[PDB]
C-alpha cells in the first residue's frame, strides 16, 4: 500500500525544455487523483478520453508522466489536433490521445530579471513530428539550395532558439509548467489501480 510519487513530477525543482521534455514511469502504486483534481491550484486541467470527475476506480498497465515548460499562449497547443511551432516541431500528441494535461503558471519561479534563457524550442524542421517523437539533433537548417557546409551564413540557421522569460511580461509571455499523464493498458499486469 504505497501511494504514487507525484511530488517528483509536480513538485520538481527543475523542469525540461519542450524539445527535450522529460518522461517518468509510475507503477505498482496506490495513486490518488482526488488530491490533484481537488487542489484548486492548477489553471488548466483537461482530460481527453477519461472523465476526471471521480473515476479513480480504474486500473491501467502503466503511467507515463511527460513534463516540460512553455509560454502561456502556447498552452492551447498541447492538445490533439493543434498546429504551430510547438505542435509541429517540439511536442506532438496523437489524435486519439487518452490522458490528462495539467498546466499551471510558473512566473514566480521560471521568470528572471533580465530574462531567463534556459528553455529552448525548435523553430525550423524539414518535416513535422510524429506523436511522442523527440528530436535532439543540432544540424543546421538550410533555407536555400546551396549546401551550408556546417556554417550559419546565408539561408543557414540554428534550428533551436531560446525563450525569453521576464516577470513583467503579459500572461501570454509568462512561463507555464505542463504535465501530461498518459495511460497504457496491456494484457497482463494492470498494476496501476490506485484506490
Amino acid at each position: 500500500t504505497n501511494l504514487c510519487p507525484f511530488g517528483e513530477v509536480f513538485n520538481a525543482t527543475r523542469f525540461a525544455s519542450v524539445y527535450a521534455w522529460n518522461r517518468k514511469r509510475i507503477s505498482n502504486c496506490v495513486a490518488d487523483y482526488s488530491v490533484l483534481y481537488n487542489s484548486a491550484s492548477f489553471s488548466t486541467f483537461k482530460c481527453y478520453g477519461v472523465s476526471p470527475t471521480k473515476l479513480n476506480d480504474l486500473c491501467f498497465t502503466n503511467v507515463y508522466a511527460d513534463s516540460f515548460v512553455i509560454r502561456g499562449d502556447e498552452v492551447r497547443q498541447i492538445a490533439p489536433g493543434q498546429t504551430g511551432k510547438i505542435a509541429d516541431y517540439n511536442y506532438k500528441l496523437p489524435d486519439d490521445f487518452t490522458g490528462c494535461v495539467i498546466a499551471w503558471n510558473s512566473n514566480n519561479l521560471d521568470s528572471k530579471v533580465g530574462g531567463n534563457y534556459n528553455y529552448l524550442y525548435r523553430l525550423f524542421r524539414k518535416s513535422n513530428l510524429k506523436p511522442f517523437e523527440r528530436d535532439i539533433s543540432t544540424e543546421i537548417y538550410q533555407a536555400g539550395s546551396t549546401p551550408c557546409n556546417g556554417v550559419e551564413g546565408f539561408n543557414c540557421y540554428f534550428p533551436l532558439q531560446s525563450y525569453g522569460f521576464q516577470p513583467t511580461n503579459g500572461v501570454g509571455y509568462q512561463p507555464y509548467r505542463v504535465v501530461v499523464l498518459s495511460f497504457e493498458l496491456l494484457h497482463a499486469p494492470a498494476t496501476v489501480c490506485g484506490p
Partner: antibody, heavy 126, light 108 residues
Framework: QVQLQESGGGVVQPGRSLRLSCAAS????????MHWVRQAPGKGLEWVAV????????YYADSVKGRFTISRDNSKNTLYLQMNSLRADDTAVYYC???????????????????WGQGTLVTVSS | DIQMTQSPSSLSASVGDRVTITCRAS??????LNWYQQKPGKAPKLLIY???SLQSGVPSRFSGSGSGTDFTLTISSLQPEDFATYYC?????????FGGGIKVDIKR
C-alpha cells in the same frame, strides 16, 4: 497474455527467396513500431530491420540492404519480411520484436524491445 | 554506424555476490540504451530500458545506470536463476547495433 508468433522458417537453396511472418495478440498493433532480429548458430544477436507504427519509414541493416524488404499489415495484425538473393551466411534464428511505448515512444520512433517471439530457424544450404 | 563494445566476454561469480557488467559505445547516444538477458535456447526478454528503467516483473535487485558513452548494469544479489548471457543495445539511430555479449558462470 501478450503473445507474438513467427512462421516461415525452413531450408532453402542459395540464390532463392523466402518470406517470414509474425502475428501479434494482446495489444493495439497500429500504435507500435516493429523490429526483426537474428542470431547465428553459436554467435550473438544482430539487428535486421525496423518499421514504424504507420509504415512511413523503413530501415534495414547494411548486410541485407538491397535484398531484404520489410512491411506491415496492421489491418490483419501481422508483420512481413521478404528475403531475396539468399547466401549461406543468412542461416540464423529470426525473432519478431515489439518495442516499448506507443508511437515514437520518447525518441525518433526507436526504443527498447520488451516483447519477443520464439523465433524460427532459417538455413541456406544445398 | 555506432559500434557497441562489450568486454570481458566471460565472467565467473558465486551465489550471494555482486555482479557488474559494462557496455561501451562509439558516439553519443544520450540515454537510449537497453539491457537483455538470455538463457540457452530461449528468447532474450528485456531487463532495463532507457538505461535506468526497470521492466515490470523484474525483481527489485537489477539496477542500471549511465549516460553518454559508457554504461553499467548491477545485480547486487546473485541467485541460482541469474546465470545467463547479457546483451546491450542502442536505440539512437539506424542501424541499431547489439553488443558482443558476456556470459556468467558458476565458480568452484
Amino acid at each position: 497474455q501478450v503473445q507474438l508468433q513467427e512462421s516461415g522458417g525452413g531450408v532453402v537453396q542459395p540464390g532463392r527467396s523466402l518470406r517470414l511472418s509474425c502475428a501479434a495478440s494482446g495489444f493495439t498493433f497500429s500504435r507500435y513500431g516493429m523490429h526483426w532480429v537474428r542470431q547465428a548458430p553459436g554467435k550473438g544477436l544482430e539487428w535486421v530491420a525496423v518499421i514504424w507504427y504507420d509504415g512511413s519509414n523503413k530501415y534495414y541493416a547494411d548486410s541485407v540492404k538491397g535484398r531484404f524488404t520489410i512491411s506491415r499489415d496492421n489491418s490483419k495484425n501481422t508483420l512481413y519480411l521478404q528475403m531475396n538473393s539468399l547466401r549461406a551466411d543468412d542461416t540464423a534464428v529470426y525473432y519478431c520484436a515489439k518495442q516499448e511505448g506507443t508511437y515514437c515512444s520518447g525518441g525518433s520512433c526507436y526504443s527498447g524491445l520488451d516483447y519477443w517471439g520464439q523465433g524460427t530457424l532459417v538455413t541456406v544450404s544445398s | 554506424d555506432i559500434q557497441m563494445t562489450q568486454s570481458p566476454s566471460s565472467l565467473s561469480a558465486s551465489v550471494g555476490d555482486r555482479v557488474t557488467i559494462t557496455c561501451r559505445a562509439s558516439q553519443s547516444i544520450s540515454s537510449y540504451l537497453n539491457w537483455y538477458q538470455q538463457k540457452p535456447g530461449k528468447a532474450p526478454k528485456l531487463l532495463i530500458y532507457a538505461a535506468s528503467s526497470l521492466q515490470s516483473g523484474v525483481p527489485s535487485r537489477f539496477s542500471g545506470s549511465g549516460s553518454g558513452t559508457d554504461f553499467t548494469l548491477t545485480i547486487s544479489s546473485l541467485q541460482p536463476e541469474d546465470f545467463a548471457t547479457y546483451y546491450c543495445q542502442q536505440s539512437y539511430s539506424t542501424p541499431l547495433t547489439f553488443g558482443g555479449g558476456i556470459k556468467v558462470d558458476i565458480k568452484r
